[PDB]
């Protein structure tokens, strides 16, 4: 399935941008009314499998109540990451990572 | 709980990161709301924007704020109220309190002036020493 970003951020990713489900940087982040961020894919799967609750505080939560968190989504994509390829030392902003990998030397 | 009075100018332990400042009033976010453009505003600053130009446009993107996509940033609200600020008793008190319980600290802080438990006593007293004015130093025993 689709969980999060697996890329090794240039400085460590801060806790506030880590998905409590998949333990990775939020992918198309969404926020709950109780104030917790998840990936869009991770949280709706839990809604479907675990029920209508926020897994961090068991507060009531329905799929429509989720709003996209485009402030974190911007900051996360602005975070700098390393290209995981063997021998490549290229650090770029996360939004440019697939731009670099498309013509990365070591692949 | 965990609320604060936005009128006060607080002195933050670490310098206030701009991500916690409102995109319109530039102060620290009070009851932050995020918009569909990905920008945060105080609650009274979103309505203030709503009263003007009909379409409240975002001060940064100039993107039109579609009220269906505005939501309370309760997570950002918590990160803000957990920011540490120095106490109002500036040099005396060494306490680094969180902003959400700033007003609760002054209610117990030793060095905030407690005017005296007396008839009159226009004496200036600290909380630490008012039991020490009932002691011998105030004019009643
Ligand atoms: Zn996730
Ligand atoms: Zn929650
Ligand atoms: Zn590379
Ligand atoms: Zn504001
Ligand atoms: Zn905006
Ligand atoms: Zn104090
Ligand atoms: Zn007295």
Residue B45 falls inside a structural domain: yes
A1 within a domain of the structure (yes/no): no
B121: left (phi over 0), alpha (psi -120 to 50) or beta: left
Residue A10 CA to residue A83 CA, distance in Å, equals 10
Domain-embedded: residue A26 = yes
What is the CATH classification number for the domain harbouring B27? 3.30.40.10
Whether B91 and B131 share a structural domain: no
Q: Using CB atoms, which residue from B37, B39, B74 is nearest to A34?
A: B74
Domain extent, residue A56, equals 15-102
Which chain A residue has its CA at the smallest distance from B77's CA? Answer: A35
H or E segment to which residue B68 belongs = none
Q: Which residues contact A40 (CB under 8 A, 6 or more apart)?
A: A27, A28, A29, A30, A66, A68
For tokens 């709706």, the residue is A44
Give the torsion through C-alpha atoms of A41, A44, A45, A50, to 10 deg.
Answer: 150
- Verify that B73 and B37 share a domain, yes or no: yes
Does B11 reside within a domain? no
Q: Which helix (H) or strand (E) holds B130?
A: helix B127-130
Domain assignment present for A9: no
Clarify whether residues B56 and B93 are in a common domain.
yes
Same domain, B56 and B34: yes
| Structural domain contains residue B5 | no
Tokens describing residue B28: 């620290």
Closest of B106, B127, B108 to residue B117, by C-alpha = B127
Domain holding A31: CATH number? 3.30.40.10
Q: Is residue A89 part of a domain?
A: yes
**Residue A7, in any domain of the structure:** no
A51, A61 contact by CB (below 8 A)? no
Q: Does A5 reside within a domain? A: no
Residues B141 and B122: their CA atoms lie apart, in Å, by: 16
Distance B101 CA to ligand 7 centre (A): 29
Question: Residues B33, B82: one domain?
Answer: yes
- For A80, list phi and psi in degrees, rounded to 5: -90, 140
Same domain, B121 and B69: no
Would you say residue A54 lies in a domain? yes
Shared-domain flag, residues B63 and B29: yes
Q: Which ligand is nearest to the CA of A60?
A: 2
A73 found inside a domain: yes
B72 lies in some domain: yes
Number of structural domains chain A divides into: 1
| Dihedral-angle region of residue A35 (phi above 0 means left; psi in -120 to 50 means alpha; beta otherwise) | left
Is residue B77 located within the same domain as residue B32? Answer: yes
- Residue B118: give the domain boundaries: 110-141
Looking at the structure, tell me whether residues B28 and B48 fall in a common domain: yes
Smallest Cα distance from A67 to chain B, Å: 7
Contacts of B8 (CB under 8 A, 6+ apart): none
Rounded distance, CA B38 to CA B34, Å? 6
Residue A87 in tokens: 């021998």
Residue of A nearest to B76 (CA): A35
B49: closest CA among B23, B78, B82?
A: B23
B3: its two tokens: 């609320």
**Do the domain assignments include residue B9?**
no
- The count of structural domains within chain B is 2
The string of DSSP codes covering A23-62 is SSB-SSEEE-TTS-EEEHHHHHHHHHHT-SB-TTT--B--
3-state secondary structure of A1: coil
Burial class (CB in 10 A: 0-12, 13-18, 19+), B75: buried
Give a yes or no: residue B136 inside a domain: yes
B70 and B121 assigned to the same domain: no
User: Residue with structure tokens 């998949």?
Assistant: A22
Tokens of A100: 């670099």
Give the bridge partners for A25, in sequence order: A5, A18
Q: Which residues of A touch B72 (CB under 8 A)?
A: 33
Q: CA A67 → CA A4, A8, B86, B100, distances in Å?
A: 18, 27, 34, 25
Query: β-pairing, B84-86 with B96-98?
Result: antiparallel
Residues B72 and B124 in one domain: no
Counting ligands in written order, the one closest to the CA of A106 is: 3
CA nearest A76: which of A24, A40, A34, A20?
A24
Measured CA to CA in angstroms, residue B96 lies from A77, B83, B87, B102 at distances of: 33, 10, 7, 9
């Amino acid at each position: 399935e689709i969980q999060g970003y697996d890329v090794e951020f240039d400085p460590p990713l801060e806790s506030k941008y880590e998905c409590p489900i998949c333990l990775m940087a939020l992918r198309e982040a969404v926020q709950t009314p109780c104030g917790h961020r998840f990936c869009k894919a991770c949280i709706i799967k839990s809604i479907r499998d675990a029920g209508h609750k926020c897994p961090v505080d068991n507060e009531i939560l329905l799929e429509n109540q989720l709003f996209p968190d485009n402030f974190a989504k911007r900051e996360i994509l602005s975070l700098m990451v390393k290209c995981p390829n063997e021998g490549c030392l290229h650090k770029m902003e996360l939004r440019h990572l697939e731009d670099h990998q498309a013509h990365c030397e070591f692949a | 709980s965990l609320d604060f009075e936005p009128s006060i100018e607080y002195q933050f332990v670490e310098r206030l990161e701009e991500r916690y400042k409102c995109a319109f009033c530039h102060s620290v976010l009070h009851n932050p709301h995020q918009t569909g453009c990905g920008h945060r505003f105080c609650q009274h600053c979103i309505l203030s924007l709503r009263e003007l130009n009909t379409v409240p446009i975002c001060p940064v993107d100039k993107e039109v704020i579609k009220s269906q996509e505005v939501f309370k940033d309760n997570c950002c609200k918590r990160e803000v109220l957990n920011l540490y600020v120095y106490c109002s008793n500036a040099p005396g008190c060494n306490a680094k309190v969180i902003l959400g319980r700033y007003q609760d600290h002054l209610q117990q802080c030793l060095f905030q002036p407690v005017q005296c438990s007396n008839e009159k006593c226009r004496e200036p007293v600290l909380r630490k020493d008012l039991k020490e004015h009932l002691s011998a130093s105030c004019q009643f025993r």
